[PDB]
Write a protein that binds this ligand. Structure first.
Ligand code: GNP
Ligand code: MG
Ligand code: MG
Length: 327
């Protein structure tokens, strides 16, 4: 398997572009940024709203926990490669505490509204608009040779009043190299694509398109997360009871993957459930034909058939968003 688009970006760019391990951090001043209040965390980070002491602008201070320095230089190299990209979080500075050498990443600040509270308030148009803005970021990172590998609502900051969106958290992101087998231990369980769940390691930018489809399904069907499994095996069973197991067996067969036998037993045999079955009167005003047609082309087992980010932006579902952008 190979990406259908932007497959040679790394292949043909100079080695320093993707050789993040040869990166040399020009450390900033740790005292320029002061913590104001905690806004998030993760297994390997503690995230704070900060303040730039020199100019009084808000910032994000992402203090890393001890991790191999390959993981810290990748993410910094990726952020440097994408800086300036549409809707791509801006990396402003990188600092260390002298005594422990604990690195902090400094980013712009987004006045975000938690997605579990913001999403349910979104009009039909807002959903169209925010996914379109998120699509810009994804087409731009893919075109620069990078897979995000962690598309999900926690990683999409939205200032609703400013209608600004930024794709944040490049901590799992990677350089796409044709043929490379990657670890499938990426993305959050609910947003993990079938390829990660059935061990197809030579995945590409289309893993982000499945994750985007998962976010979109959740927003139009008002069901977060849309595919709610308790562990990977179960994450695949949840997918199989929606998409059907016939599609799954075509996919497995095409790529020549045999399921772990018990996983196989667990998956069973399920009929494809049409998309309108999730329609209910709360989500009614969001689940039109174009929405289903768009969603249906993102949630395909075959990562090769999913729309590219560039194609999705031109889908008729986003026509009104595009016309507004033209003014
Ligand atoms: N208000 C606000 N909150 C933010 C901002 N940036 C990050 N956060 C909060 O901090 C959280 C975690 O930071 P993130 O960069 O995603 O996390 P990570 O530490 O690498 N974690 P993970 O890999 O699990 O997603 C975000 O999910 C978000 O809720 C921001 O710019 N503004
Ligand atoms: Mg995150
Ligand atoms: Mg992360």
């Amino acid at each position: 398997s190979k990406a259908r688009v932007y497959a040679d970006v790394n292949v043909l760019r100079p080695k320093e572009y993707w050789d993040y391990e040869a990166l040399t951090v020009q450390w900033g001043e740790q005292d320029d940024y002061e913590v104001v209040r905690k806004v998030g965390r993760g297994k390997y980070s503690e995230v704070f709203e900060g303040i730039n002491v020199n100019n009084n602008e808000k910032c994000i201070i992402k203090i890393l926990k001890p991790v191999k320095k390959k993981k810290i230089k990748r993410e910094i190299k990726i952020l440097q490669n994408l800086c300036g990209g549409p809707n791509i979080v801006k990396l402003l500075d990188i600092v260390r505490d002298q005594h422990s050498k604990t690195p902090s990443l400094i980013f712009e600040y987004v006045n975000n509204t938690d997605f579990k509270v913001l999403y349910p308030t979104l009009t039909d148009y807002d959903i169209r608009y925010y996914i379109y803005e998120l699509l810009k970021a994804l087409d731009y990172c893919h075109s620069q040779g990078i897979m995000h590998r962690d598309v999900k609502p926690h990683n999409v900051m939205i200032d609703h009043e400013l209608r600004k969106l930024r794709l944040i958290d490049w901590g799992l992101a990677e350089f796409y190299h044709p043929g490379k087998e990657y670890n499938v231990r990426v993305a959050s369980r609910y947003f993990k694509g079938p390829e990660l769940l059935v061990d197809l390691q030579d995945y590409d930018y289309s893993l982000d398109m499945w994750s985007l489809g998962c976010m979109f399904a959740g927003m139009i069907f008002r069901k977060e997360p849309f595919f709610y499994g308790h562990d990977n095996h179960d994450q695949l069973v949840k997918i199989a009871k929606v998409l059907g197991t016939d599609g799954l067996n075509v996919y497995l067969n095409k790529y020549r993957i045999e399921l772990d036998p018990q996983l196989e037993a667990l998956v069973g045999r399920h009929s494809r459930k049409p998309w309108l079955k999730f329609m209910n009167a709360d989500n009614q005003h969001l689940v039109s034909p174009e929405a289903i047609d768009f969603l249906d082309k993102l949630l395909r087992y075959d990562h090769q058939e999913r729309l590219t980010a560039l194609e999705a932006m031109t889908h008729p579902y986003f026509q009104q968003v595009r016309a507004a952008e033209n003014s």
